[PDB]
């Protein structure tokens, strides 16, 4: 009868809470009034479209302003000594010298420097003028409108799909593997061959003439002939200059390895062959599940067949087909887990093997990106583990999964939790113990007494990969190894050359300071997983509260009685888990930032010597590289690092409000409000105004979220200001 | 005086007319004194009145 339209219960709430929950309840379909599986799936589908339309519009927006407000064309001509423009600024709040200050580049007013690496992205892909950016902006905007269209389209009763269709998993897998993965990477490879490669060779190929231009001299003869080697006949020379004819070859598909020496990025020929190769594996593999032809696998049959003899895995995977196909949260958990891993995967491979020409020369961009994807990966992981327990509560069928791997999982969960506890306490005690030991020796002027363990195991791996520093002589280090002799005339010359250039990021040199920090990160991993896993497995029931599953995923507590039950819900478990996310990726991003900062600065001996103790982090990382940042203004004058320092403090202030909502809880605030609501009602003149919605204190769960949110935002923004301002 | 200010404040009386007047004529008040662009009144439409400064990586 009032908004929340989707909840009678919340709509009848007389207070301001109705509002808050209404905002908070909006996307939870299963909890709305008179909901069905059909409406659930259909709303989810439409929502996916909605997301896509926002994404395409967002991307088009970037291209739009780079083309309209940027210096894209000044960059292409001189990428090394021009700062890429993101956007113009029109701020009526700025003072006279502010407008002078922010006018960087070739700009006719105040501008901001892009640290997204979209320049080098574009530029490496083939984008040459503002025109190209405009056309792409129009296109993707058109795709946005199309997606919006499509959302409302399959909302009508004629175009409403049936639940059976949504449950056709085999078909979606076949199509996504073959088409979405296979075809689209094949088509990209098409783009690299037809546009990117020629663009790097200095021949501008556009919509109007591609069809008329030969990418290879004897094109499409090798292809059908099976003389594929001709496509790798003459690669670009070692003196090739990117985007110019000088030193350019004709090959379209190679396995060279290493980098394009002047740009220091992967070879677009290697990238072409890569996308093409995977494309084939995807296309062949995408014909694996049974649909409407009779040929193909059964998922159910595969899963149910995989039960080992002598019941060492119980009933194996029997019943998982149904509990997965039914459970949406399960699918989102698997998806988020995989997506989180690959997000960090991307982050860790991109920095050490950059793919873009004249990236990695851009320090700030690289730092910004690598922080970006690791934090995104962290949040995504916590979320994976957050729809973990939502499954465990709402979705699991105890009878239908009897004695399976899943039920057996629940069975020995105390073992799992307790052994994670062991693994985290071990690390926590020893690593901290060895650091603080290292500090005390530093303090007393005896650094020779430090406990510095050399990372022999990683140093071994680097040796097996062909770095020769450590002199183990294994695999790709040793010249008398089959592994060496096999591919020595393939790509190893490009590889080995790149691994041993220590001015690049590829498999950096490692010492005892590396050793400690990785075990700090391991502490990060294991503990966060302890919170999340514990929260997932005890979502259903515990000894304190056996009937927890009757309440659901978020609840304040179960009262003060029998000891006290604050932060008992799996919700709260995930909440607690976010703090470790934050702390852990905080450590990882620092690790990253410094070990590069000292590389770029030209003194890696700063890192190796101060990373072995924590004051070293405090003094040589934090205290040193904020010098310029905090100076952005002083009583004497100003410079260009105004916004970062403003935002630095902004983040800190957000960070401390969070503490407010986290530490102080409801009873104080409500009674505060209780006196205020009397105060209003017997204040004359003001008497004549009264509220419609009774003023009430935010909930516990509300307080829980609002703290967390402020904390995270402050975290991110503060670092971002630091990272960028210092690296720049 | 009560006759001066009954007749004067009787056409704007209605509540529906305020969301039509105050919103659209109020935007017409921002879009007038907002678009009207020199040093005379604010220091941004003034613009940069000196030559560009040198960056950190030998940039323009």
């Amino acid at each position: 009868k009032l908004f929340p339209k989707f909840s009678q219960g919340l709509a009848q709430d007389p207070t301001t809470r109705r509002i808050w929950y209404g905002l908070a309840m909006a996307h939870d379909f299963e909890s709305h009034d008179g909901m069905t599986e059909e409406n659930l799936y259909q709303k989810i589908f439409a929502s996916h479209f909605g997301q896509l339309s926002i994404i395409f519009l967002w991307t088009s927006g970037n291209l739009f302003h780079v083309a309209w407000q940027g210096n894209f064309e000044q960059w292409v001509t001189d990428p090394v000594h021009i700062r890429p423009i993101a956007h113009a600024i029109w701020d009526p709040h700025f003072g006279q010298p502010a407008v002078e200050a922010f006018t960087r580049g070739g700009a006719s007013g105040p501008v901001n420097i892009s640290t997204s690496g979209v320049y080098q992205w574009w530029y490496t892909i083939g984008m040459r003028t503002n025109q190209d950016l405009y056309v792409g902006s129009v296109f993707l905007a058109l795709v946005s409108a199309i997606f919006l269209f499509a959302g409302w389209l399959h909302l009508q009763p004629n175009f409403q799909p049936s639940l059976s269709w949504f449950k056709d998993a085999e078909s979606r897998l076949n199509h996504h593997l073959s088409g979405l993965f296979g075809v689209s990477s094949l088509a990209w490879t098409g783009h690299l061959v037809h546009v990117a490669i020629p663009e790097s060779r200095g021949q501008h190929v556009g919509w109007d003439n591609f069809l008329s231009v030969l990418p290879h001299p004897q094109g499409l003869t090798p292809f059908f002939t099976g003389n594929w080697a001709a496509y790798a006949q003459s690669p670009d020379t070692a003196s090739h200059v990117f985007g110019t004819a000088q030193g350019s070859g004709q090959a379209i598909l190679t396995f060279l390895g290493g980098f394009h020496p002047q740009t220091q990025s992967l070879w677009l020929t290697d990238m072409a062959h890569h996308h093409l190769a995977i494309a084939v594996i995807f296309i062949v593999a995408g014909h694996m599940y049974r649909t409407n032809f009779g040929i193909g696998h059964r998922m159910q049959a595969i899963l149910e067949a995989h039960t080992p003899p002598s019941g060492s895995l119980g009933a194996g995977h029997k019943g998982l087909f149904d509990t997965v196909n039914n459970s949406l949260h399960f699918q989102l958990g698997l998806a988020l887990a995989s997506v989180g891993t690959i997000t960090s995967l991307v982050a860790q491979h991109m920095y050490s093997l950059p793919p873009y020409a004249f990236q990695a020369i851009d320090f700030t961009t690289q730092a910004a990106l690598y922080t970006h994807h690791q934090y995104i990966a962290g949040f995504i992981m916590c979320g994976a583990f957050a729809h973990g327990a939502i499954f465990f509560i709402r979705d699991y069928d105890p009878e239908q999964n009897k004695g399976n791997v899943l039920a057996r999982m629940l069975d020995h969960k105390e073992a799992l939790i307790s052994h994670l506890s062991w693994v985290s306490l071990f690390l926590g005690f020893h690593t901290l113990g060895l650091y603080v030991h290292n500090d005390v020796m530093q303090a007393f002027g005896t650094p020779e007494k430090q406990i510095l363990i050399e990372p022999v195991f990683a140093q071994w791996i680097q040796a097996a990969h062909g770095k020769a520093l450590y002199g183990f002589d294994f695999l790709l280090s040793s010249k008398t190894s089959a592994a060496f002799a096999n591919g020595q005339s393939l790509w190893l010359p490009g590889w080995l050359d790149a691994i041993n250039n220590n001015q690049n990021s590829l498999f950096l040199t490692i010492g005892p300071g590396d050793f400690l920090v990785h075990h700090a990160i391991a502490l990060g991993l294991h503990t966060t997983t302890l919170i999340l896993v514990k929260g997932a497995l005890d979502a259903r029931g515990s000894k304190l509260m056996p009937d927890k599953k009757d309440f659901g995923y978020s609840f304040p507590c179960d009262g003060p009685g029998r000891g006290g039950t604050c932060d008992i819900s799996a919700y709260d478990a995930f909440y607690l888990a976010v703090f470790w996310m934050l702390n852990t990726i905080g450590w990882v991003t620092f690790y990253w930032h410094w070990k590069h900062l000292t590389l770029w600065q030209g003194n890696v001996a700063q890192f190796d010597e101060s990373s072995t103790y924590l004051m070293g982090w405090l003094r040589d990382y934090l205290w040193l590289n904020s010098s310029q940042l905090i100076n952005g203004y002083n009583p004497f004058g100003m410079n260009s690092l105004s916004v970062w320092a403003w935002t630095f403090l902004f983040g800190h202030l957000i960070y401390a409000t969070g503490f407010m909502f986290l530490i102080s809880w409801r009873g104080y605030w409500q009674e505060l409000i209780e006196t205020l609501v009397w105060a209003h009602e017997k204040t004359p003149l003001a008497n004549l105004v009264y509220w419609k919605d009774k003023p009430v204190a935010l909930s516990i769960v509300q307080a829980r979220l609002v703290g967390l949110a402020h904390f995270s935002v402050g975290y991110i923004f503060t670092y971002a200001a630091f990272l960028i301002a210092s690296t720049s | 005086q009560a006759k001066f200010f009954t007749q004067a404040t009787d056409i704007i009386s209605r509540r529906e007319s305020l969301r039509a007047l105050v919103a659209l004529s109020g935007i017409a008040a921002i879009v007038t004194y907002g678009l009207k662009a020199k040093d005379a009144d604010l220091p941004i439409t003034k613009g940069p009145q000196t030559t560009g400064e040198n960056g950190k990586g030998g940039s323009v």
């Binding site: 009032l2 509002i19 209404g22 113009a88 029109w90 419609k692 | 919103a23 935007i27 439409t45 613009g47």
Partner: peptide, 29 residues
């Protein structure tokens, strides 16, 4: 100075002004 003189103060005020207005009426009524 042509475009951003119009679109900045409309996005700054006139979008949140009628958004806070029409969303308030959606909440209370």
């Amino acid at each position: 100075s042509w475009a951003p003189s119009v679109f900045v103060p409309l996005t700054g005020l006139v979008l949140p002004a009628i958004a806070m207005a029409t969303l308030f009426v959606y909440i209370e009524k």
